[PDB]
Design a protein around this ligand. Structure first.
Ligand SMILES: Nc1ncnc2c1ncn2[C@@H]1O[C@H](COP(=O)(O)OP(=O)(O)O)[C@@H](O)[C@H]1O
Ligand SMILES: Nc1ncnc2c1ncn2[C@@H]1O[C@H](COP(=O)(O)OP(=O)(O)O)[C@@H](O)[C@H]1O
Lengths: 89, 228, 88, 226, 89, 88, 89, 88
């Protein structure tokens, strides 16, 4: 319940809208609404990226509800994100 | 048989008249031994003394930093480059790096070189760090072939050309065999000091000096071994 | 003010692979993303040098965002059809 | 049984009678030690003294550039080629390079060789840098087979042949052969000494070891007599 | 127009009639008639192979109309020859 | 007296992969091979130590024969559905 | 005729009932009856394994009718056992 | 005067693989390319030595052209069914 996931992107770099395109359909074709999103253009508001001290783009997800975790990359490989989706049990 | 002067302080007499002409000369050494510097000084001797116009091709370095490099020894180039001096082909990597959707034939570069030459009347061209081109594009297949087509094209045009490439004495051919006469600049470390030396293995189809001889740098590279 | 520009080497195989697959992209996906420019760098390379190219076939794009340039055969249809895009 | 002279200055006596006959002898050294020279000059020695026509196969070097090579020694080969004596076979890679769509039967080269010989009646053949095909073709599989059938075909034809290959190591996937000279360039102290080591000639009288040498118009060597 | 392609074969070695069999159907199933052919049995007329200074069998194609190029091998791998076919554009 | 016991690490991804695929085994193959026990070793690990476990997720079985223990994601469905069995 | 094949197993180790399960269906789905079987639980009658001096489990087959041969392993890879089946010719 | 000759090692598995796949070639592709000869080199190897063979199963052919010999399991159906042929 109240599931959360948040994403770090680099403006509109190719790898990362690869990532976003492939992602939004994952997040609302499997299940229409687990949870909405936040996208972070680290190119023009990076201090949020720095206070979260994230290091890479595109860096995906959120660590609440438990545990603290979460995954980076192209996100073309649907298997690993649908292997890293949590909840249900 | 052919030959071309360089007048680097004390190198020419070992080559008994300098580099081969219409032939590709490869220069290899461990990082930090002034290969790029050798190329620069070579071509600057050329244009200043012989007015043998030049092309300096750079993969590793940025122009602004190669001029600020060479300006250390008291050579001011860009203002004099306005004279129609030497032309620096910028082959520095796009910092954003590049993505691949298929293989490439580096025709752009070689053709760019030859327009640059046929515009600048150049008879001499140096090329800094081909291994970087091997570490630029992660395809070690083609770069061999197209470096080869470059060097061959230069042999056709009859221009004097130089190539710079990156354990000194032991197994040293780097990774780029593909050339027709080879100078190896090694600086050896013994005890706790450093000896900068030049070896010429051989210059193919031409007089060459027998063995390796130490050198140091000033405004231009110097050594004078042989007396008598 | 749509723009898209392409660099080729005469008619090397890699570059007619490139051209075929490109135009077919341009008339299977979207008819008019951006107009085109093709350059046989063999007899006008000064254009290639103002473009500071090093490799062929080099396909590039400036506006709409971002300023970009990708090279090759354009055989890997996945990554290049992933390297189209816009939205903004 | 049998052997053939080289009449190159001071090598012939190291081999106790020169190169073997009807057998392919391999010549190897690190790059930059004048193997190609040994080959060229071998065929030129053959043809100039014996009028024993030669076929020089070259991958690494360029034909015209091998003649501009040889003019250093003051020898006109193009006149010798028009004399109908020596032929420099161009097997240099097309600078345009190669594309590959399958496996090879390298018959073309060998058939070219044997046509060249059986036309020029040649009794001497040099082959400079088989290693170049290895720097050309990325298949270390077949070249085994086609080098073997080459050298064997040449032994059918019975001609004396030389193969050049690229410090104190082995043979860098060149496969064993039936008689081998390894000419090594040594780096000692802070000078460099060119020496010729002759490893083996099987079934034949032979000299012991490594022997220092230098270059003139032709290679010069220092034996030991008296 | 007036497209040209010429082939070097080694008599009837297995690899090379592999090559020819696989080839003729390529050259007249895709398009019935771009252009006819020449086959060279380098085993009994090799001086033509020598004046063209070709080195390998089976060695395929022709370098006119531009550019000078062209490809060797088994030619089982149809992809590379249909990637190396030129013309049309 | 059917028995089957399973060891998990809270809700690490590997272990909900494991749990999902396991229960789905347990209700696609055979509904009731053996009852189950799941252990969040984070707040009762002394049980994990009496079980002398070293890794998670660790799936184990005692009787019917033999005494056995296999670890992992339980992603490799082939070997684990090969590591079920009984007969005797 | 009178074809023979005999098997060495380790009680009910996973690999080996993998092996047996996969095996019995091979031996009586391809052909219902070439020949029946013998299974050896080397865990509680190993001296037979020792007089035959076999070394591994699961170790499969028999060396009569000719020749003396035969194959070990998981036996999941049906290809190699149906490549090692003998008889018919 | 059709001819084709084959060399086998008694009844080693590789060679009944070979024989099965061969006869099946001979009666799926072409019924009668060439008659056959099979040799259990164990009790008549002098024939194998006049044939100077070194390996089994060795499959060979003499006329029509060329004189040829290929070895093995004859499992790689692609290359052997590519190593049939004739035309001339
Ligand atoms: N004033 C100077 N005195 C001594 N050495 C200098 C001076 N200016 C430059 N150098 C030398 O020039 C060298 C640059 O060449 P190198 O390091 O080999 O770079 P590259 O590989 O690009 O040639 C440096 O190693 C540096 O020691
Ligand atoms: N003036 C000269 N003095 C000495 N050697 C020469 C001269 N001119 C040409 N040569 C010879 O021409 C040879 C070309 O052969 P090369 O390819 O260098 O052999 P390697 O394969 O060992 O590098 C040189 O090795 C060199 O010995």
């Amino acid at each position: 319940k109240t599931a959360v996931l948040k994403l770090y992107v680099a403006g509109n770099t190719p790898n990362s809208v690869r990532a976003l395109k492939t992602l939004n359909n994952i997040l609302e074709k499997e299940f229409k609404g687990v949870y909405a999103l936040k996208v972070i253009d680290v190119l023009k508001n990076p201090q949020l990226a720095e206070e979260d001290k994230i290091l890479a783009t595109p860096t995906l997800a959120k660590v609440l509800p438990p545990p603290v975790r979460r995954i980076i990359g192209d996100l073309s490989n649907r298997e690993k994100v649908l292997a890293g989706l949590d909840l249900l049990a | 048989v052919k030959k071309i002067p360089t007048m680097i302080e004390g190198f020419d007499d070992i080559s008994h008249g300098g580099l081969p002409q219409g032939r590709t000369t490869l220069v290899s050494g461990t990082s930090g031994t002034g290969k790029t510097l050798f190329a620069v000084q070579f071509l600057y001797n050329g244009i200043t003394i012989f007015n043998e116009p030049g092309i300096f091709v750079t993969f590793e370095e940025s122009p602004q930093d190669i001029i600020k490099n060479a300006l250390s020894f008291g050579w001011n180039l860009q203002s004099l480059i306005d004279q129609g001096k030497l032309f620096i082909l910028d082959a520095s990597p796009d910092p954003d790096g590049q993505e691949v959707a298929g293989d490439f034939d580096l025709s752009a570069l070689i053709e760019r070189i030859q327009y640059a030459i046929r515009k600048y009347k150049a008879t001499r061209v140096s090329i800094d760090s081909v291994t970087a081109v091997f570490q630029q594009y992660d395809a070690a297949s083609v770069v061999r072939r197209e470096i080869f087509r470059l060097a061959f094209r230069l042999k056709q045009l009859g221009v004097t050309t130089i190539m710079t490439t990156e354990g000194p004495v032991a197994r040293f051919g780097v990774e780029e065999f593909v050339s027709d006469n080879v100078v190896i600049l090694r600086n050896v470390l013994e005890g706790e000091r450093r000896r900068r030396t030049v070896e010429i293995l051989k210059l193919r189809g031409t007089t060459h000096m027998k063995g390796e001889y130490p050198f140091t740098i000033n405004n231009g590279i110097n050594i004078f071994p042989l007396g008598a």
